[PDB]
Design brief:
The structure is a homodimer. The first copy, chain A, is an alpha/beta fold. In chain A, 26% of the residues lie in helices and 29% in strands. Chain A has one domain. In chain A, the strands form two sheets. In chain A, strands 1, 2, 3, 4, 7, 8 and 9 form a seven-stranded mixed β-sheet that branches. Chains A, B: One of its GO terms (cellular component) is protein-DNA complex.
């Protein structure tokens, strides 16, 4: 059997490997395929989005600020009033399911952006090479803090979290294999807290 | 003055920082802003695409195969016949200006894909965590070979290169500042060979 999963950016940058490697080990007969984009079929969606379709909130995901470890002027925590006086890297704001848009929804916040990339790993790579800052999930910053030489800081905003949801087509749940995968995906996702 | 640049994926993962850092050093009065997406304004586009708009081919860009250094079964070069017997990570194939689509344009090639991500840095991150392979520019693989623990292999296909172009609106070139930026961007881009 083939399962088509959509794991949206940035969640795909840790969950895709975890899901793929696990299912590869315990069920080599099962073939899982992944897409990250939300343009429009697809058995399961893992995202920060609610589809109203069955949607299950899995956890509240803490967000943080990231910058290069080698930044010449950022070291310790920032004040809320100072967040948007830095230069920011973010993912494309205008697209559906944009990870970054909730933190740059006004003109003054958007003016701080110097780079809009396609995915959060592109954002992190640019941050690692520049003086730009970005807002990212804590698990993502920590996963790449050592390899990409990033420092992590608290996000001093009231909107410092995002809820991760597992979603599927309600009618499809009435199937043994669909239920097995649902259970598997809940376990793997919840390990992110 | 403000310059809006579009540096398409994957070129943004090295050129965005190089352009931004350089212009930041030699002309702090100039403000450069970057987007990577090609949805549809924008003074300059750096991509593998020709717009017919002035387009200048800058260099032929050599492509390679990448895999995790820790892969259990990939070590040395592959045979052409073996390329699509691996499991592949790629960027979304169907979108305009998709980097990956030229290497997965048939059903048999597309069947090798297990992961379609939004950007090549997402692809590389998944490769680094799995047994998947991907096709990437040599400069990109080498930039992240050490940090993401990647091995590099020749791409044994006839289509082993892509041409990078700098493009702009012809009417806009009749301006001193536009010419200065054109000259700057040519120099920086050509350093990728």
């Amino acid at each position: 059997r083939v399962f088509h999963l959509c794991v949206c950016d940035p969640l795909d940058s840790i969950l895709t490997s975890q899901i793929y490697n696990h299912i590869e080990q315990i069920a080599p007969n099962i073939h899982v395929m992944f897409k990250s984009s939300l343009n429009q079929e697809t058995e399961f969606v893992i995202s920060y989005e609610d589809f109203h379709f069955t949607s299950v909130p899995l956890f509240k995901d803490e967000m943080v600020l990231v910058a290069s470890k080698n930044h010449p002027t950022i070291k310790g925590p920032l004040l809320k009033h100072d967040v948007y006086n830095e230069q920011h890297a973010a993912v494309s704001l205008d697209r559906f399911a944009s990870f970054s848009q909730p933190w740059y929804d006004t003109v003054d916040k958007q003016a701080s952006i110097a780079y809009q990339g396609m995915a959060m790993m592109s954002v992190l790579s640019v941050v690692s090479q520049t003086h730009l800052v970005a807002i990212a999930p804590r698990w993502l910053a920590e996963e790449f803090a050592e390899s990409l030489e990033l420092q992590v800081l608290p996000l001093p905003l009231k909107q410092n979290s995002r809820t991760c949801y597992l979603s599927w087509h309600e009618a499809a749940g009435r199937d043994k294999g669909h239920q097995w995968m649902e259970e598997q995906l809940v376990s793997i996702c919840k390990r992110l807290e």
